[PDB]
Structure 1
Amino acid sequence: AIAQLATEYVFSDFLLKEPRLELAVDKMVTCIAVGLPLLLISLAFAQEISIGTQISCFSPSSFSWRQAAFVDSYCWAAVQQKNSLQSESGNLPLWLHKFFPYILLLFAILLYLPPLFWRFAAAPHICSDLKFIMEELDKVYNRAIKAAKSARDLDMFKYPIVEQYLKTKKNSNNLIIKYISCRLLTLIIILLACIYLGYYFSLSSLSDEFVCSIKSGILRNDSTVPDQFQCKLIAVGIFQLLSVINLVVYVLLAPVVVYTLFVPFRQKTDVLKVYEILPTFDVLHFKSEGYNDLSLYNLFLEENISEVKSYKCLKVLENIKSSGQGIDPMLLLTNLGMI
C-alpha cells in the first residue's frame, strides 16, 4: 500500500542519480538506511496478505457473529484510551503496536529528506566549480604541450586563474557547513531511530495481551454482555523481529556515518600532486588540514579526476621518470598526442 507506493518513488528517484554530486560512502549509507525499512514494511504487508489480523478478542459462545465482530472492532479502537493487563500494573502504552508500520514510513521520509535538501542546496555550485576546474586543467595541460613543442621548433604564461580561484575558495566555509549539517541531521535521525527501536523491542516482549471491557455507554447495566474480553494483538512478533533487524542494522551503520563525518581525515590521496608535474602548473601542495571547502573540493576531485583525460597520461610520465630511464621530459611530452 503506502509502503508499496513509497518504495517505487524512492527507488525510481534513486536510479536517476546513478547515470559527481555524491560520494562513494555516503550514497551507500543513504541507500541502505532508506531501503531496508521500506522493504521490511512492504514485507509485513505481504505477511498480512498471507495471514494476518492485528487484533482478535475471545467472546463467549452465546455471542453471534456480528456481536463478536463488534467486540473485536471496539477493542481495536479502545486501545488508544487505556486498557489494563492481568500481568502488569494499571496501564501501558499499547498504541505503539497499532502505529509501528507507519513510524517506519516516517523514519524513512526523515532519512531521505537530508539527501534531497543537499541535492537542492549543493549540487549546482559543486558541479559548476568542478566543471570549471577540470576545464582549466585541460586548458593548462594543452598550453604546456604548445609551449613544450614550440621550444623544440626554435631549437630545430597565462595567469593560473584556477589556482587563484581555489585559493579564494579555501577561505569560504559555506559548502562545508551545508555538507556537515546534512550528515549531522542524518546521524541524529539514525540515533533517534535506534533508541525508538530499542525501546519498542524492550516493550514488545511481554504486553501483547489485553483485558478489554465493552460496557461503555448503555451496556453498563446490561446482563448478557460479560465484563472482560481477553483480547490479544497478533502482529506483535513480526513487528518485534523487524524492529530488532533494523536496530542491529542501524547500530552497524552509525559508525560509518561517524567516520565519514570527518571531512579532512577522509582525504587520503592527493590528486593534484600529479598535476603538479606539468611545468605550467605551480607547485602547491593543496593539503587542507582544516575544515574548508577546498577539502570537500579535494574529496570530490578524488572521485571525479578519472573523467579528465590529462590525469592518466600525465601520471604515466611520472612513472616513466621514476622508472630509472634517463629520458628528457620534452621527448616524452612530444610523445604525447594532443587531447
Structure 2
Amino acid sequence: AQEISIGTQISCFSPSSFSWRQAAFVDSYCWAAVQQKNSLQSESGNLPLWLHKFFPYILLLFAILLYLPPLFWRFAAAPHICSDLKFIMEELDKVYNRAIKAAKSARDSESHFKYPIVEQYLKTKKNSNNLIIKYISCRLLTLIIILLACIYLGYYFSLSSLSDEFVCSIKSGILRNDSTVPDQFQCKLIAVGIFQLLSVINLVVYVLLAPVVVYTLFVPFRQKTDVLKVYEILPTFDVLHFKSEGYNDLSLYNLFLEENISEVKSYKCLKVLENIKANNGEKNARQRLLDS
C-alpha cells in the first residue's frame, strides 16, 4: 500500500545537465547495479545491499515455509484422525448408554473378552503407532523456521547502519570514455526506513512465538489430567489408567481429546454425578491478495 516500485525504491542525484530519461537511467542502472556487480562501491564494510532489493520477496517465502507444516499436516494426519476421532465419539456414547440400560434392570474360533473396546483401543495406540512422528515433524519445522527468521530479520535490523546511502557509478562497456557523465552518482534506498520497522515488529512476535512452540513441544507435560477420569464411575469398566510420556499416539490423542471431549454429549452428563457425590478461509484469502 506504500506502492513499492523503483520510483519509490531508489533515487539518485543526477546533475541538472542530465535531462529526463538519463536521470531515470541512473535510477534504473543503480537499482540493478546492486545485484552483484563490481560497480557497487558502498564503502561501509563493503556490505551487501541485496536484502533491501528483495526484502518483501523473502518475507513472503517465510509465509510459505511456515504454511508448509500445517498444510502437509492437513493432508497426512487429519484424514487419519478425522476418521478415528469420529469412531471414538460413537463408541463413547454407547458405553455410557449401555451402562444405564442395565441399570434399569439393576433394581428391576471365537476370542472375546469382558473388557470394552474403548479400554483396549486406548491400548492399541500405546505400543505400535506412528501418528506422533507426523506431529513432531510439524513442530520441528515450525521451530527451525521461527529460529531462522529470528536470525535473518535480526541480521536485517543490524544491516541498517548506513546501508541506505551508496555511491553508484554507471561507467560501463561504452560509457567509460564519457565526458558528460560524472563518475559518482549519489543514490539512496527509500523504503528501507519502513523495512527497518518491519524487521523489529516482525521480530518481537517471533521472539514471542519461540517460547510458545517450546510449550507445545512438551506433549506429555501439557496438562491433560481429567479427560476420561470422569468415566470411571460407570461399572462397565473399572480403570482407565494412563501415564503417557513418549512416542505414543495415546500421548497425542489424549491431547486431541481434551479439545474435543466437550463435543461428546455423554461427557457433560457424566460430570454432574461426581461433583455432588476464519483461518482456513483467511490464509486462503490473504495468499492471493498479497501478490496483487
- Same fold per TM (> 0.5)? yes
Contact 1:84 1:211 in 2 (8 A): no
Residues 220, 336 of structure 1: alpha-carbon distance in 2 compared, 3 angstrom cutoff: closer
How many angstroms apart in 2 are the aligned matches of 1:286 and 1:338? 49
1:132 CA drift (Å):
1.3
Contact 1:59 1:68 in 2 (8 A): yes
Once the two structures are superposed, what CA deviation does each residue of 1:7-64 show, in whole Å capped at 9, x if it has no partner? Answer: xxxxxxxxxxxxxxxxxxxxxxxxxxxxxxxxxxxxxxx1227997100011111111
How many angstroms apart in 2 are the aligned matches of 1:337 and 1:75? 27
Contact 1:208 1:233 in 2 (8 A): yes
1:267 CA drift (Å):
3.1
1:218 CA drift (Å):
0.9
1:210 CA drift (Å):
1.4
1:298 CA drift (Å):
0.5
- Partner SS state of residue 315, structure 1: helix
Contact 1:183 1:257 in 2 (8 A): yes
1:338 CA drift (Å):
55
Contact 2:13 2:185 in 1 (8 A): yes
Residues 338, 209 of structure 1: alpha-carbon distance in 2 compared, 3 angstrom cutoff: closer
- Partner SS state of residue 239, structure 1: helix
Contact 1:210 1:230 in 2 (8 A): yes
1:162 CA drift (Å):
1.9
Once the two structures are superposed, what CA deviation does each residue of 1:172-205 show, in whole Å capped at 9, x if it has no partner? Answer: 3411111011100010011101100011110122
1:288 CA drift (Å):
1.3
Residues 61, 158 of structure 1: alpha-carbon distance in 2 compared, 3 angstrom cutoff: same
Once the two structures are superposed, what CA deviation does each residue of 1:191-229 show, in whole Å capped at 9, x if it has no partner? Answer: 101100011110122121111111101111111111110
1:83 CA drift (Å):
6.1
Once the two structures are superposed, what CA deviation does each residue of 1:79-108 show, in whole Å capped at 9, x if it has no partner? Answer: 112467777357321111100011000000
1:161 CA drift (Å):
1.4
Residues 292, 302 of structure 1: alpha-carbon distance in 2 compared, 3 angstrom cutoff: same
Q: CA RMSD in A?
A: 8.2
How many angstroms apart in 1 are the aligned matches of 2:289 and 2:150? 56
Give the share of equivalent positions with the same residue, in percent: 98
| Mapped pair 1:64 → 2:12 | no
Once the two structures are superposed, what CA deviation does each residue of 1:300-324 show, in whole Å capped at 9, x if it has no partner? Answer: 111111111111111111112199x
1:271 CA drift (Å):
1.4
Contact 1:82 1:91 in 2 (8 A): no
Once the two structures are superposed, what CA deviation does each residue of 1:278-307 show, in whole Å capped at 9, x if it has no partner? Answer: 111221222313331101111111111111
Residues 114, 293 of structure 1: alpha-carbon distance in 2 compared, 3 angstrom cutoff: same
How many angstroms apart in 2 are the aligned matches of 1:244 and 1:336? 24
How many residues matched? 280
1:268 CA drift (Å):
3.5
Once the two structures are superposed, what CA deviation does each residue of 1:213-260 show, in whole Å capped at 9, x if it has no partner? Answer: 111011111111111101111111100100111111100111000111
**Gaps in structure 2 of 5+ consecutive residues:** 280-287
